[PDB]
Amino acid sequence: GPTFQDVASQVFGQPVGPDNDGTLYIFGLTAKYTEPEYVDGRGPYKSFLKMLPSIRWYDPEHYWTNGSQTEGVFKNEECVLCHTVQTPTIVNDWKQSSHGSKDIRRGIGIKKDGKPVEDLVGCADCHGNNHQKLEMPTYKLCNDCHPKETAEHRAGGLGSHTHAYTVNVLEFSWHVGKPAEEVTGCAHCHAIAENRCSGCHTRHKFDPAEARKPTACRVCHMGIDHDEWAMYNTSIHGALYEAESARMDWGKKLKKGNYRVPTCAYCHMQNGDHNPQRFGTIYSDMGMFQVDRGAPKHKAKRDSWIKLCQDCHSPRFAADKLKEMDAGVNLSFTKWREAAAVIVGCYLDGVVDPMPEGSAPDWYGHYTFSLLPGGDPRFYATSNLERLGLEMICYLTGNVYKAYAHMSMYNQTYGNGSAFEQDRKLVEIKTEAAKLRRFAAIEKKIGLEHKSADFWKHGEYLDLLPGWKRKPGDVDVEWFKRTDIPHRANADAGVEI
Amino acid sequence: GPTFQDVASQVFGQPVGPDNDGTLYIFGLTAKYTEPEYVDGRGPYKSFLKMLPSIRWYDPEHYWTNGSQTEGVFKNEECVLCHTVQTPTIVNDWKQSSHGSKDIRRGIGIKKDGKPVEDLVGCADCHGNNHQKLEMPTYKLCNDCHPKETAEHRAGGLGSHTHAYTVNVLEFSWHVGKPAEEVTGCAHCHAIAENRCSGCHTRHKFDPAEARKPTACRVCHMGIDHDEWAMYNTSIHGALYEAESARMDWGKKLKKGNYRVPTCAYCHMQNGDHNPQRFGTIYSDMGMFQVDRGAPKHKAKRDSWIKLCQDCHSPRFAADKLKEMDAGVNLSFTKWREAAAVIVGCYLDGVVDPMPEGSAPDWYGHYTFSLLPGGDPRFYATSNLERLGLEMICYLTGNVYKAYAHMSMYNQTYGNGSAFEQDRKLVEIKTEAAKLRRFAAIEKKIGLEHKSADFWKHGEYLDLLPGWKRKPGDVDVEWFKRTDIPHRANADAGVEI
Amino acid sequence: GPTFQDVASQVFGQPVGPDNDGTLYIFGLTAKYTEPEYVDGRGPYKSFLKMLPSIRWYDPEHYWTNGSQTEGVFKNEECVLCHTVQTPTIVNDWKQSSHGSKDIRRGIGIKKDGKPVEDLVGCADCHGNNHQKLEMPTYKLCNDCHPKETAEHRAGGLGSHTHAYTVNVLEFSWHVGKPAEEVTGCAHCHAIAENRCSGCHTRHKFDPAEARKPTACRVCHMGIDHDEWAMYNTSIHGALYEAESARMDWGKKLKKGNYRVPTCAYCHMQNGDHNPQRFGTIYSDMGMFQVDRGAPKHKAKRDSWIKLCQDCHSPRFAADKLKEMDAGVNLSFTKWREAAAVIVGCYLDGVVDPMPEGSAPDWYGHYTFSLLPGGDPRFYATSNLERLGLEMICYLTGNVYKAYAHMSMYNQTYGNGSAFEQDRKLVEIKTEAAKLRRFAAIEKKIGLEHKSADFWKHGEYLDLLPGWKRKPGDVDVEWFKRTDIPHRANADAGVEI
């Protein structure tokens, strides 16, 4: 029988065809989805997880291969001469880096194999000399000469740069639950943070002054999921950053008295510490878990933050501000608990449309309510009620904490990820619940047997989801048995974590 | 019987407990809300209004107390020596201010008690000499030496910095209607504008050049409620600000011919006037009230704006642009009136779900429709229809004016607070109304007696609202009788305003 | 009978009156809409299209008239002397331009009528000498001395600056379908791009260094419809722009090796090319039409982009990144096709509320479903289902392409115009469809004959729409017969395009 594409083709006079053939498809109506070429993904879901081949740049230890057309074994100087023509800005960057320019070195005392590095560190020193065997490095390379910074970069827990990809890409429901090409940016953002040393001070200048700016963090630390850039930017600190950035001295080390305006790096990479997570009171799943950071048991961490603020403030003022955070966060969770009760209530009364058996299976292969134990909280391939619930906990409640932590008066109250956005979301959730209950009450009284629409279960995108093909024995539980990395509490992990 | 927390505890294996004990509560599910420590709030609702104790910094005349552990009576120079170690950036700021540095003084002619201030103005001069009796100032202090700027700062009407807190926090429905810790940022944002002189030129540098930048305004003048920063930033003026900020001379006084790119301060603090409200045609409740600023009766104000624009433009061009504002605003109100008719229509036909008696009482203690006279227009603890109505008038219609006033082509039409967002909101409002009417028609025909869900009336957050505990005689009407400040037209004011 | 205004007046004690009389109308409730003064619009819908008179500045060839009060015939030098007082910043700009300052000229070889322009190019040279016959120029003037840049500016196709106004304002459904004052910003934004040479390097400095910055593009190239500024800004390129803008040398020509950080102009006005559209693979209606830019037939364009990226990158890296775009775009269209099937499905089953005959006629004067052939896809004056459909294709699906094209990891996945926003919109669309189907099923079973509410068809804004007054013979089809400009595929064009 005719597909959507076939019918569209008959109406628009454009033939049906594969999406990838170069045809300009009118509103994409007659194009058929083709699976891109994949490589196998790593981690506990390696039986079905895929990546686009471009993962080569971001997990090079497992995917990098020679793909160059240029042959030869060259000296550093030859790399530079040719790349001056072939990739000019890479050479320009490198010539403006202390690797490539002795004049801007600070005599730090860099050593490799116990011996001082006094020469230029050239293209070949980082990439190899043989153009058919070029290397694409990770922090492993940098460790040869920068062990302190590397050790710190590798010292974080779950929720830090240290495990951003290895755990929080490869084990994460929203990543493993979707076609690889949909979530490439997830893999790369998280992998840049973990596997590279260029997230903050970019290649090839590797300039710490660049790394001190909020621009060194906000590409990743932004948005509806974790809006700390916006929270910072809409604080008075953030406004003063914008005011003073052009004329302030960014060449000063992150130290007490060196800056008027605090940046992300100033407060989180205190005194140049490359394990920024460690200053946090406790990992709270981005504020989705409730904790009072001002409670007696967290006094050491609270006192440490107060002292940090005291670089530029009264400690009494700082203490008050962090207490405002504690209070504002605790109030915010009353609205989440209201929402959760309304949402689970609907499930328990059987009035959610669709019910879980009416949707595509979740990424575990289960027909399980997303906001119950064992479910997969999500914004896609689920009911409107469940979507709104996820938005309430993740996008709003988590960001109230971020708004308070970063002194954004507006976003604590009115703005994105605020108290008032929680209010509005709560109204939306109650509205959905009310509609669902009124439909169910009417249908019961008149004896109409409602069946949820097939579009909740099947469709061109929904049919691509991995939940359909999950089967017993498809989890690499040995991965989850590893104790050298932490793990996510996934329902099908199959072992103790 | 078990609460939500008790049930959650039994399912997740985490004990129920107080939110404030430091436990990391899984999705905040088993945490119980505790009331933070409060102090009494001021104003006409002082019988129940509360503040967090940190209000000490923002309304210090009424809440400031000694809270220091350091004892002694010190000279200015001693303040500096110790704070160089203890709060270094405050000293650095102060040393870079004309208060603390004679070299950057301009010989303005500052006097205290009729005598010239020729000495440094040190920590002790503003905070006192006794470390157990330190003072936290307001504009009252600055008035000692800067009477002109202070008088202007105090010359505004309702809707200006002058009464931002005293009237528009302490009398405002959305503030008084919510638990104190939810709205701390409201109190402080508005109180910084009223009680301080550091909102634009921050302490401790007090640099007018900083105050001239848009960053001196946008922390407060932003967002869905009043998006003028975004309107400015998405105008060509705003783009040119971003382009020229790094290299332009911000040390020039706000004067005709001193700037290529106009900022908030250039247009609103014309010639350094510290009463920025006065250049406005008329107060319109943030554009929620409709007025044609191009009408004959406003000619003097319109001509004054045209002349301001003529610093850098043809007055004919300026006149045309402000006429575009008038026309665009007048069109925008047709959509609001459509929305209002649809919404009130639903109330009058009794089909809103919930009806007002089905919700928690409003902050007056009334079960009154929010979009009728005497009601409390709001986005929280109300029906979806009422929420959308408030969003239509406040967030969108008001911001259409702001988009036109600031020359944002995109936000006048497509963007945030635009004509097209009004369109979409109007569709949402009609959609809600249609759903409500279809449910009511069905329920009438089949004889189903619909009762609005209990979650509209009760819940962990809704139960905290002050409407529940309002009672006769709980308003300080003497406050509203004051003629030395203006007042909001609150339903329970009890007197003439 | 009483209107909404009359009833409101009786309730609020404010008389009904015209919106334009200067009265401050309480919530705009008692104000009556008045039609602003219009001039006739141009193009194929000239029989009813209107413009505000301020169109004089933007289509001056057809609308400019003398409106000055100053009389006299003056020399350049006299223009400057008086305007130093009367419009100081225009003179300041001009004195800082190479037109008005020989010292900053670069000896480019500018000629007029085959002769070198060695004098200052003064106010009178561009505006005329007679103050009662002043000229308001377009690119036609600039062509006298800058033929190369003008020819390129005029070399684009549909979707470029070249036809932004002449075709894509005057023929565009959303513009012609709305009252003129609602869409003034549309006319001007598009007309600035087409008719002027000041969109990027603003008057009166006309500084190419300014034009190279992202600020030269983002006022227009922003927002929910086409969010490329945000996509760029949330890429690492964009973060590096913010980091380096203050200290980088913007005086360098856009050339390989002159910049570390690429801007809009660097990538789209390659080597100073003033036809930025031409580097695009193919026009795709802002990504609403699906095309795989990595397909064999587009190899030349793909290779050209790869080489552009190779200014600062491996071509293998660049190739991989553009393949990620291809793959991500192709996945994004599966969700659109799902949405479209759900939406059209509802129309074909007759369950959309309102159905098209229940709404105001579209701008063609038809009662036609907006998401069928011959309909007018839109966000206003339509059903919620149709609104959400338009949002899915235009605001989200189109912007997924923009997110990938500009390397925004976050906006490809989580952010504005992303995969996950598509997910959420798809849930919304299915939710609307489900509600519509459940209502229809109930109403059928109980024998309730549903009539869509009158507010879908009539209202103060809806009644202003041009669809009501469309009639046979009201299209200037001769316009559409023109072959010297391209055309939009409008349903009532009446001829071959």
Ligand code: HEC
């Ligand atoms: C000092 C003035 C800060 C600046 C500048 C920025 N942040 Fe921050 N952040 C700060 C505090 C006091 C807290 C709360 C920590 C606590 O335990 O009390 C935070 C929180 C974060 C987090 C969450 C960390 C966690 O939960 O453990 C993140 C990811 C974060 N901040 C990032 C961040 C970024 C990207 C910033 C610049 C845009 C930034 N912060 C500014 C203090 C300060």
Ligand code: HEC
């Ligand atoms: C952001 C989160 C960063 C990541 C990831 C890495 N670095 Fe870094 N680095 C960053 C900042 C903000 C600074 C300046 C800190 C300060 O004290 O002002 C630096 C500095 C360095 C240095 C210079 C150290 C010195 O003695 O001056 C080095 C050698 C360095 N960084 C190396 C490095 C390595 C090897 C990384 C990967 C493991 C790495 N950095 C990641 C910010 C960030």
Ligand code: HEC
């Ligand atoms: C950078 C552009 C990001 C993209 C794209 C994705 N995420 Fe992210 N992630 C980012 C940051 C900065 C943070 C930390 C914020 C904090 O306060 O800690 C997050 C964190 C999440 C986490 C933790 C979720 C939790 O348990 O509470 C996970 C598992 C996660 N990120 C994974 C991930 C994946 C794979 C994405 C798409 C499938 C997603 N993120 C987008 C920023 C980056």
Ligand code: HEC
């Ligand atoms: C008058 C011109 C002042 C001088 C001189 C100094 N300070 Fe100040 N300070 C002043 C005001 C009006 C305020 C209130 C806040 C506001 O912005 O209006 C303050 C605040 C403080 C604080 C508390 C706030 C904080 O950021 O922690 C402290 C601890 C403080 N001031 C200390 C201080 C010191 C040590 C000074 C000398 C170096 C000093 N101030 C100078 C006004 C004035």
Ligand code: HEC
């Ligand atoms: C001159 C070019 C301006 C700049 C720069 C900014 N604004 Fe403005 N604003 C301007 C006009 C002509 C108007 C309309 C006033 C009238 O009566 O016609 C406004 C309006 C405001 C308002 C509302 C004032 C009122 O209703 O009386 C506010 C609060 C405001 N503008 C603030 C503001 C800010 C914060 C700006 C920088 C981000 C800014 N404006 C820029 C003119 C100009």
Ligand code: HEC
């Ligand atoms: C933003 C709304 C401001 C507030 C609130 C206050 N000030 Fe201000 N101040 C502001 C600007 C934009 C400028 C520069 C204006 C100009 O003409 O360019 C200033 C300047 C001052 C000065 C210097 C005056 C002089 O003769 O050079 C002083 C002494 C001053 N401001 C004091 C002051 C006081 C006492 C305030 C509280 C009452 C205050 N300012 C608030 C912006 C803003």
Ligand code: HEC
């Ligand atoms: C700064 C970060 C703000 C916060 C937080 C709150 N508001 Fe605000 N308020 C702010 C500004 C800049 C403006 C003026 C805009 C204009 O065009 O005039 C507003 C104004 C409102 C008003 C007037 C409402 C009206 O009658 O039309 C009130 C009463 C108000 N603000 C009070 C207030 C409170 C107490 C808040 C939370 C409970 C809220 N605001 C957030 C910016 C600041």
Ligand code: HEC
């Ligand atoms: C050609 C190179 C010009 C010279 C020399 C001057 N102006 Fe101009 N001006 C020019 C153009 C093409 C335009 C149209 C708008 C656009 O951006 O393309 C203008 C506009 C004006 C205006 C009206 C717009 C406004 O901002 O008010 C005025 C009042 C104006 N120009 C005056 C003016 C004066 C006094 C000049 C000499 C100092 C002058 N212009 C030089 C092009 C050119």
Ligand code: HEC
């Ligand atoms: C190089 C690194 C770029 C920068 C900097 C910016 N853009 Fe871009 N853009 C770039 C590519 C490779 C593409 C895809 C083109 C293709 O055919 O593969 C685009 C796309 C656009 C478009 C759409 C053009 C089309 O569909 O033909 C627009 C309108 C656009 N970009 C604008 C734009 C702006 C305003 C930018 C700065 C904010 C910008 N781009 C940055 C490459 C690059």
Ligand code: HEC
């Ligand atoms: C943005 C899309 C632009 C529009 C529209 C126009 N110009 Fe432009 N111009 C722009 C840039 C980014 C640059 C610098 C390009 C570079 O190679 O670095 C320029 C430069 C010019 C120049 C100088 C040429 C030279 O030889 O140095 C001229 C004379 C010029 N532009 C004229 C011009 C005219 C006549 C335009 C209307 C037809 C016009 N520009 C539009 C960006 C943009």
Ligand code: HEC
């Ligand atoms: C600048 C502030 C804009 C305003 C306001 C309007 N539009 Fe726009 N338009 C703008 C740009 C930068 C783009 C190009 C983006 C790209 O990737 O090509 C658009 C394009 C649209 C198009 C094409 C629609 C299509 O067929 O795919 C049209 C017809 C259009 N713009 C017209 C137009 C009108 C008249 C507007 C309001 C009625 C609307 N635009 C707002 C930016 C500018």
Ligand code: HEC
């Ligand atoms: C070690 C200090 C390096 C030196 C010296 C040079 N490069 Fe490099 N490069 C390095 C790393 C760790 C990476 C991986 C990406 C990351 O950000 O961590 C790279 C990447 C490249 C690439 C591919 C990426 C791209 O932008 O195209 C190329 C083509 C490349 N490097 C080339 C190159 C050349 C020519 C160099 C000498 C001038 C050079 N690199 C120096 C680390 C180091």
